[PDB]
Design a protein around this ligand. Structure first.
Ligand SMILES: [Zn+2]
Ligand SMILES: [Zn+2]
Ligand SMILES: [Zn+2]
Ligand SMILES: [Zn+2]
Lengths: 298, 298
């Protein structure tokens, strides 16, 4: 097959709208779509200082890559989970990505600041579950401490769809109230946006490979995959299913709609916050930085 | 394997709770579960005159069969869809079932009273879609005209689950407000109940075969199957999924919660009702009967 817009060999078939595209015209389509998403939902403006949490996975990598190419002011943060025999390679993937992207990369090593790696704490709570708590907290407090205006994550259409299906099966109506491409700044919660909201996981894979981004497959090696497979099954039966599901969700989201921590002063239900209680912290963590390990002199 | 309660060969494995059961102890388990369901949701009382809409399918057949065995006062209604080469065999299956069950069977032939069989109307609305409208209307007006206290249908756990998943994918929040095992009597809408709410489709199949009920597979031969397959997939991955989904739904159902027809005087949004407008009816249909074709003299 040949590209819709030139004589080059097709690199990928895009379903909506229907067109075969070569590598370069696919890149352009992908970048335009992401730009369209930012515009439609008013996610970002070019004056904002944006932080991208880069796990070394494809999604956050492509996010930082495209925001950069689009001309946004982005810096990246990699949160090293402290798993011996795992996290070192992950951090290396994130570093290589940011070098390629040309974004400053800040690193927080959980094991260094908290004393323990993910999967080393004496608790029966699943490693990846307190991992999620810990990571979200650090992303936000780092963004906050350093005066960032926004955090962009790499959640794509397939992520939103699978998260939606999962939370509906479990009737997690609280989670269901808080979906969509944007969580507006609210107190010490920094604005969080999802620029890849409307691109598919398949398009993300294709984009990374097109621009020479290399990535790891699994951030925490300790369901979503079940949901994605189910949704992929349904999608092949009835193309348009995933998109239709999310669109419907955005319209009905409203139906799910019905302090400061004594340690770190970040938002807290209860007087001491979840992060602080779990980690047994008596003192605040200061994530303020004046430079990166890679550019110590500015 | 041997039965949990005797020395007979296992007929089926029940998952919740875990037990192998012979034919007779399975029948007993199934009948008890249905009885438990009626009790828990206050669906029916033994004094009520109950109508079961029997399609010739396994679900309505087992419903009428068990309500009868439990000692309820049940009569059956078969609504013949008027499909040449299809409906005759379906009606015959319903007749044989009611003979076996020992319930009076009333028959309404759509083609006789309306002039047209399902799939013969000059409309682009899917045959099975106006079939659904027509059938629900007739069931209710027949129950009403004849002074029945309740209509019992054969929807089982798998039906509720698949209907739920389908309507959530489409965000049919109106439909979502109206689920669960009971729709209380409301004006000329007769009380509708689902006694098989807590038994699985697999248990229904096993019960019919155990009691010698024969049935057709498809009422209207012109998605749910897609949903059931998906849900069966998920169930084998994580047993307990279907039940958990419905239980969660019952608890959250509340979140979806926000006349008389000029022709037939049955409930109508708009001054003329959907049934009447579709069929272009200028006159009411009187479903009052003094007897059955099989017992013309009482
Ligand atoms: Zn091209
Ligand atoms: Zn705190
Ligand atoms: Zn037995
Ligand atoms: Zn009417």
């Amino acid at each position: 097959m040949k590209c819709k817009f030139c004589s080059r060999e097709a690199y990928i078939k895009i379903h909506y709208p229907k067109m075969y595209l070569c590598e370069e015209h696919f890149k352009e389509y992908f970048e335009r779509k992401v730009s369209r998403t930012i515009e439609r939902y008013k996610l970002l403006t070019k004056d904002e200082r944006i932080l991208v949490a880069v796990s070394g996975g494809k999604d956050s990598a492509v996010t930082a890559y495209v925001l950069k190419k689009l001309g946004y002011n982005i810096e990246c943060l990699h949160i090293n989970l402290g798993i011996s025999g795992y996290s070192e390679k992950s951090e290396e993937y994130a570093k290589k990505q940011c070098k390629l992207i040309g974004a400053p990369l800040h690193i927080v090593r959980i094991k260094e600041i908290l004393g323990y790696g993910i999967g080393e704490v004496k608790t029966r709570r699943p490693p990846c579950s307190y991992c999620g708590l810990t990571k979200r907290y650090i992303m936000n407090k780092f963004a906050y401490d350093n005066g960032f205006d926004a955090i962009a994550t790499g959640h794509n259409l397939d992520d939103e769809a699978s998260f939606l299906l999962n939370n509906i099966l479990h009737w997690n109506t609280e989670y269901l109230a808080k979906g969509g491409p944007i969580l507006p700044q609210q107190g010490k919660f920094i604005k969080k946006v999802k620029p890849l909201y409307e691109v598919t996981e398949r398009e993300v894979v294709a984009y990374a490979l097109a621009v020479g981004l290399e990535y790891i497959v699994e951030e925490c090696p300790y369901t979503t995959l079940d949901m994605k497979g189910v949704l992929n099954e349904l999608e092949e039966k009835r193309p348009g299913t995933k998109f239709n599901f999310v669109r419907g969700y955005l319209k009905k989201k409203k139906l799910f709609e019905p302090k400061e921590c004594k340690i770190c002063r970040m938002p807290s239900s209860g007087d001491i916050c979840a992060f602080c209680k779990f980690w047994g912290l008596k003192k605040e963590i200061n994530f303020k930085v004046s430079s990166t390990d890679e550019e110590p002199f500015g």
